């Protein structure tokens, strides 16, 4: 069968499923962006942009 490092080659001749996989990747990236922003908001201290700005945190 396909070796583990080639499992995704089944997409090469399946435009529909390739688009699905790309949609899923895009979903994951957008989801990461959302999650990351939420976590940063849950941990960010806005009270001192002078000596405690975002890049210190």
């Amino acid at each position: 069968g396909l070796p583990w490092y080639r499992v995704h080659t089944v997409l090469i001749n399946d435009p529909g499923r390739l688009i699905a996989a790309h949609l899923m990747h895009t979903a994951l990236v957008a989801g990461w962006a959302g999650s990351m922003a939420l976590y940063e908001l849950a941990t960010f201290d806005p009270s001192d942009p002078v000596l405690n700005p975002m890049w210190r945190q």
Binding site: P46, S47, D48, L51, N52
Partner: protein, 121 residues
């Protein structure tokens, strides 16, 4: 001349009475007569809270806040003595009334500041 049923639920009960733009006259004070304040009303429109800086040597500012306990903030039905002093000055001595309100305001970022808004004594 409003009744309770005109007023109930409108938010008007937490507002102090007002005077027209025409009321710019003068109320004469007779030194011989005794005076009282029959009704004192105080309606807060803004609650400011002094920020607490980190370096402690920076000028602290009073910042705006958001009222979160609704139209429950006004002091009213306060009465007291109005003394005429030797120098012609007047001194109000509060004797009674609804002269406090617990108030919670919220700072930017969510910190809540409860206070006993008051003019007791």
């Amino acid at each position: 001349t409003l009744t309770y049923d005109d007023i109930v639920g409108t938010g008007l009960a937490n507002k102090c009475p007002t005077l027209d733009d025409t009321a710019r006259g003068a109320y004469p004070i007779d030194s011989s007569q005794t005076y009282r304040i029959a009704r004192l009303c105080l309606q807060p429109t803004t609650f400011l809270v002094k920020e607490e800086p980190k370096n402690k040597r920076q000028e602290a500012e009073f910042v705006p806040t958001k009222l979160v306990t609704r139209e429950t903030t006004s002091l009213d039905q306060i009465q007291g003595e109005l003394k005429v002093n030797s120098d012609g000055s007047l001194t109000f001595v509060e004797e009674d009334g609804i002269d406090f309100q617990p108030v919670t305001v919220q700072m930017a970022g969510g910190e809540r500041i409860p206070l006993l808004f008051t003019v007791k004594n």
